[PDB]
Amino acid sequence: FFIINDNNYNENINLIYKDIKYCGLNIQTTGLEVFDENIRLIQIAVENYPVIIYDMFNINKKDILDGLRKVLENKNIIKIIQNGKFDAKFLLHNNFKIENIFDTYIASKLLDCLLKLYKKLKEEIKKENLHIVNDIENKCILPICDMELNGIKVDLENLQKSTNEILNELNIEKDNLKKKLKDENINVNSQQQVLKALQKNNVRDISNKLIENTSDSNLKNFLNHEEIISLRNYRRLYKLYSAFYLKLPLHINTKTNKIHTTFNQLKTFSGRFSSEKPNLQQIPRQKNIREIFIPNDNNIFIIADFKQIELKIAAEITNDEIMLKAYNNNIDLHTLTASIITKKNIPDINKEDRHIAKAINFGLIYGMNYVNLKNYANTYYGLNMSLDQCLYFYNSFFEHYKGIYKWHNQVKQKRALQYSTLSNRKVIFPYFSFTKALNYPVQGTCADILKLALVDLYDNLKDINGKIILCVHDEIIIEVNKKFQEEALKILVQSMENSASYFLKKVKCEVSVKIAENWGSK
DNA sequence: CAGCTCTACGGATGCCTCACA
DNA sequence: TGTGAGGCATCCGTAGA
Numbered sequence: 001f002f003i004i005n006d007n008n009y010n011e012n013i014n015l016i017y018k019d020i021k022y023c024g025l026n027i028q029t030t031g032l033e034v035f036d037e038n039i040r041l042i043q044i045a046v047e048n049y050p051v052i053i054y055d056m057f058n059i060n061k062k063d064i065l066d067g068l069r070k071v072l073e074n075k076n077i078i079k080i081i082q083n084g085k086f087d088a089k090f091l092l093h094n095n096f097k098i099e100n101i102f103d104t105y106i107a108s109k110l111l112d113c114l115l116k117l118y119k120k121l122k123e124e125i126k127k128e129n130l131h132i133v134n135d136i137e138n139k140c141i142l143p144i145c146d147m148e149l150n151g152i153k154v155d156l157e158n159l160q161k162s163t164n165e166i167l168n169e170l171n172i173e174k175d176n177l178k179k180k181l182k183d184e185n186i187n188v189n190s191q192q193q194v195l196k197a198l199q200k201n202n203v204r205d206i207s208n209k210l211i212e213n214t215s216d217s218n219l220k221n222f223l224n225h226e227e228i229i230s231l232r233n234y235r236r237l238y239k240l241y242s243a244f245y246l247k248l249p250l251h252i253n254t255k256t257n258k259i260h261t262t263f264n265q266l267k268t269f270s271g272r273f274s275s276e277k278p279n280l281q282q283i284p285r286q287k288n289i290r291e292i293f294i295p296n297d298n299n300i301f302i303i304a305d306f307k308q309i310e311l312k313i314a315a316e317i318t319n320d321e322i323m324l325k326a327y328n329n330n331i332d333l334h335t336l337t338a339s340i341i342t343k344k345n346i347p348d349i350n351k352e353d354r355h356i357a358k359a360i361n362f363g364l365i366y367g368m369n370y371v372n373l374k375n376y377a378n379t380y381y382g383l384n385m386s387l388d389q390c391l392y393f394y395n396s397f398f399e400h401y402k403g404i405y406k407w408h409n410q411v412k413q414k415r416a417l418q419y420s421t422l423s424n425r426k427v428i429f430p431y432f433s434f435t436k437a438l439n440y441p442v443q444g445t446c447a448d449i450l451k452l453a454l455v456d457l458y459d460n461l462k463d464i465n466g467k468i469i470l471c472v473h474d475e476i477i478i479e480v481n482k483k484f485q486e487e488a489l490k491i492l493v494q495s496m497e498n499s500a501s502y503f504l505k506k507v508k509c510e511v512s513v514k515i516a517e518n519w520g521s522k
Numbered sequence: 523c524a525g526c527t528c529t530a531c532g533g534a535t536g537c538c539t540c541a542c543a
Numbered sequence: 544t545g546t547g548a549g550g551c552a553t554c555c556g557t558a559g560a
């Protein structure tokens with residue numbers, strides 16, 4: 001239980017660091033915040049020796065923290081950190097460099113005193129063929145900490161101007177809705193009462209069906225009444241205002257005017273990323289909102305987005321010959337499923353058309369039936385398509401891609417309840433859910449590809465001082481000094497394609513890369 | 523029985539509790 | 544003998560991939 005300070009600093013302790021493998025590093029501090037506190041005790045545990053402790057509040061100057069920094073920066077020595085997302089954050093925040101972080105928490109979450117725990121976790125992950133994903137996550141710990149440290153900078157002037165504008169628009173829409181409803185005594189945010197107000201106004205479907213649910217899907221069916229438009233518009237404006245615009249400035253840390261979110265690695269069932277504080281993942285797609293996120297001055301962003309990542313993992317899982325043949329021809333499946341039922345011709349597909357076709361493709365790939373598909377297409381598109389035509393189209397798609405149909409068959413027959421993705425991320429379902437079963441593998445593989453891409457990205461940008469700032473389920477965006485922007489673009493391409501090659505062998509993945517002044521200008 | 527899936531988050535609404543003189 | 548304030552799980556609805 002040696003305590004290292006100026007009184008008994010002999011410099012011989014550094015000789016212990018020579019030729020070592022494990023070190024159960026765990027730090028202590030005065031609180032939880034990273035920009036407002038400092039490290040009090042750093043504890044390092046070495047096998048066959050008592051835990052050694054360093055206190056930073058009494059040792060000053062340099063030449064004492066030489067062995068510890070050398071061990072930390074070394075890539076050949078593993079650092080066992082309990083919940084290595086807070087301690088590593090503190091270590092990286094200051095002028096300390098840490099590498100080869102191994103977390104027992106991450107390993108534990110991939111299932112069903114640090115020295116013993118490392119073995120008890122490594123042996124159990126090696127017996128389960130989870131070593132690849134565990135290595136990817138442990139090497140991805142550092143990119144997560146880099147994202148948390150950097151955060152993202154906000155264009156406050158545009159944000160506040162837009163907040164005032166949306167406030168005015170919401171005010172006028174509230175006035176219009178209150179005038180139209182002829183009530184002026186009901187909170188428009190109470191669904192249970194506005195639905196009654198709609199009922200007592202003679203609003204019903206053209207098929208003599210009264211309003212029952214106000215969900216936008218059901219709310220569109222009951223159009224042709226000059227009251228549903230007002231409800232939809234207000235609700236959209238009210239969400240755009242309250243949900244994010246009001247709550248965005250309250251999440252900005254002081255003295256840095258940068259949003260420092262919180263990134264979670266295993267709080268999502270499929271292995272994707274959950275941001276439990278201001279959800280930069282949830283920003284509205286429209287560019288006019290994401291234009292408020294900006295680089296630090298004189299720097300620039302690289303943004304990369306996977307090109308139709310899904311339906312490619314599905315293609316390889318299914319061994320569907322026609323799918324892979326089409327992919328080799330560079331034709332979008334989403335655009336095809338658009339043009340088959342929509343405005344004619346392929347090149348006349350816009351972003352909204354591509355999005356609704358994306359919804360249809362994932363629906364019926366994961367199990368959406370032809371009557372629900374009819375409802376979806378009729379609601380979101382002005383087809384007025386009949387049921388028989390929809391059934392014929394459904395059958396045509398399911399027979400055109402024979403591999404897809406055969407896969408659907410086998411998954412329907414089997415009830416193993418155990419599922420996995422291309423990196424052996426095993427899951428035990430509670431009950432056999434058809435669409436959940438079809439959906440787990442593809443999204444899990446997508447998340448694993450994203451994590452490996454991040455790992456390589458951080459391990460490879462070190463030569464040009466590269467920093468990663470955001471990652472939304474398949475898209476990566478990074479900061480690099482403008483002097484090296486083109487190199488950073490090539491860096492991100494190599495960071496993603498190679499990662500894809502580690503999982504998808506048949507179809508060559510592609511990535512859209514862009515040079516961006518904002519998070520919005522994709 | 524039969525299917526589109528994962529997540530977070532704001533805001534109404536009965537249930538629970540207690541309290542005193 | 545009366546509210547009563549508060550919170551506190553439970554849905555509705557839309558946001559994003």
Ligand SMILES: Nc1nc2c(ncn2[C@H]2C[C@H](O)[C@@H](COP(=O)(O)OP(=O)(O)OP(=O)(O)O)O2)c(=O)[nH]1
Binds near residue numbers: 307310474
């Ligand atoms: N199940 C499902 N997933 C959806 C839906 N809309 C979007 N996604 C998700 C699933 C994929 O992980 C994710 C891929 O990111 P994008 O939204 O950009 O789509 P994708 O890459 O397939 O197409 P892209 O080439 O980027 O236009 O989209 C939907 O309606 N259903």
Ligand SMILES: [Mg+2]
Binds near residue numbers: 305306307308309474
């Ligand atoms: Mg994409």
